[PDB]
Amino acid sequence: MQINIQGHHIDLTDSMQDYVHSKFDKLERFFDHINHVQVILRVEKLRQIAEATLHVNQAEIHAHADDENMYAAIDSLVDKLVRQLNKHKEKL
């Protein structure tokens, strides 16, 4: 798993990156076929937006989540990714 975190119109801090890494390190223990991962954190007006695309074996998992708080946005994003990963894990 190689994670690339990018920011847009936001002060991307090491805490955000550390937090993102933390969430994905937990995730890989349940889904072990995660190859490349892209994450984009950005702000649209007051909206804090977290985007992610996970490239897994023979498929892609994509989702966005937004919140007034970026860390909460990231947590919501992961919950969406986990749901999709569980479904995709089921198929396989």
What span, in angstroms and rounded, lies between the C-alpha atoms of 16 and 88? 27
**Toward Co ion, which CB reaches closer, 14 or 91?**
91
Tokens of 67: 């919140």
- The reply on whether position 80 binds Co ion by CB under 5 A is no
- The reply on whether position 66 binds Co ion by CB under 5 A is no
Least Cβ distance, residue 36 to Co ion (angstroms): 7
Q: Total residues contacting Co ion (rule CB under 5 A)?
A: 2
- The reply on whether position 55 binds Co ion by CB under 5 A is yes
What span, in angstroms and rounded, lies between the C-alpha atoms of 6 and 33? 22
H or E element, residue 90? helix 70-91
Residues that bind Co ion (CB under 5 A): 51, 55
